[PDB]
Amino acid sequence: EQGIELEHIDSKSEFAHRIMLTNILRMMGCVKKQKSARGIETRPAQVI
Amino acid sequence: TRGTGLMSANNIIAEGIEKMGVRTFSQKEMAFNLLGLLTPEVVELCQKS
Amino acid sequence: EIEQPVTTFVFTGQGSQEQGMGMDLYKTSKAAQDVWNRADNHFKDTYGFSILDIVINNPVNLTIHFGGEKGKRIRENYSAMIFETIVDGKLKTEKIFKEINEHSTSYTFRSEKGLLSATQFTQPALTLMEKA
C-alpha cells in the first residue's frame, strides 16, 4: 500500500489489513484447533 | 532490507542511512537473521515465554 | 445364598492380543471404563501416549513430542527410566532409551506390522483387557 494516507484508506487497505492481520489470527486459530482436536499438547508451532 | 539488489527508491538512500552508523540488510542477511530464530536454543526460548 | 462350584481363574499370556480387544466391554461397563481410563490417563500424563489409541487403531509408528513445559516433564520420565543394579556394594544406573537426552525434541516407537504386538505395549494392553 503506497500513497494511501488516512483519507485514502479504502477497499485495497481494508483487504491488505485482512491478509496481514485478521487472517493471520485466523490461520493461527486453525492450527490451534487442529492440534487440540488431536490432543497435541507437546508440539507447539513457532509463529515467526 | 535492500530488495533484489537493483536500483530502488529505497536502495539509493541505503548507503546514506548507513553513514549514520546504522545497518541495512541484504535479503540473505535478513533470512539468516530469521533462520537464526529456528535454532534449537531460541525454539526452546519461545516455549518458555 | 449358595456358593458357585469350586472355581479357578487362569489369565492369558502374550500372543493372544488382537486390535480392538476389550473395547466392546469399554462401551458397556462402568467398571471396565474406569480401569482403561485410569491407565490411559497414567500413560498420557507420564509417557505422552494413549494405550487406548494403540489398542483401538494399532498404529505402525508412534512418535512422542517433548515440546513445552509439559513435554520436558514427559522427557524426564523417559530419561529417569533406569536399571537399578547394586555392584561392589554401591548402586549403578543404566538408561533405557539411550537416544533420549536434554536435546531430544521427540522419540519414535517403530514396528513392522503394528505397535500392539511390540511387547512394551502388548503387556499393558493385555493386562488391562483382563483386569477390566
Q: Which residues of A touch B34 (CB under 8 A)?
A: 48
Q: Residue C59 carries which side chain, given as an amino acid letter?
A: P
This structure was determined by X-ray
Q: Residue C75 carries which side chain, given as an amino acid letter?
A: R
Residue C61 phi/psi, 5-degree rounding, is: -135, 150
CATH number of domain containing C80: 6.10.60.10
Give the dihedral sign, CA A3/A6/A12/A16: positive
Asked if residue B24 lies in contact with residue B30, where contact means CB atoms within 8 angstroms, the answer is no
Q: Report the candidate in C52, C51, C50, C107 with the shortest Cα–Cα distance to residue C76.
A: C107
Asked if residue C51 lies in contact with residue C125, where contact means CB atoms within 8 angstroms, the answer is yes
What residues of chain C have any CB closer than 8 angstroms to a CB in chain A?
44, 48, 50, 64-68, 70-71, 74, 106
Most distant CA pair in chain B, distance = 43
Distance CA B35, CA B46 (A): 14
DSSP result, C46-113: HHS--HHHHHHH--SEEEEE--HHHHHHHHHHHHS-B--EEETTEEE--BS-SS--TT-SEEEEE-SS
Kindly list the partner chains of chain C, i.e. chains with 3 or more CB atom pairs below 8 Å: A, B
CB contact under 8 Å between A44 and C66, yes or no, is: no
- Whole-Å CA distances, C27 to A23, A31, C44, C111: 41, 31, 20, 28
Q: Which domain holds residue C104?
A: 60-113
Model resolution, angstroms = 2.8
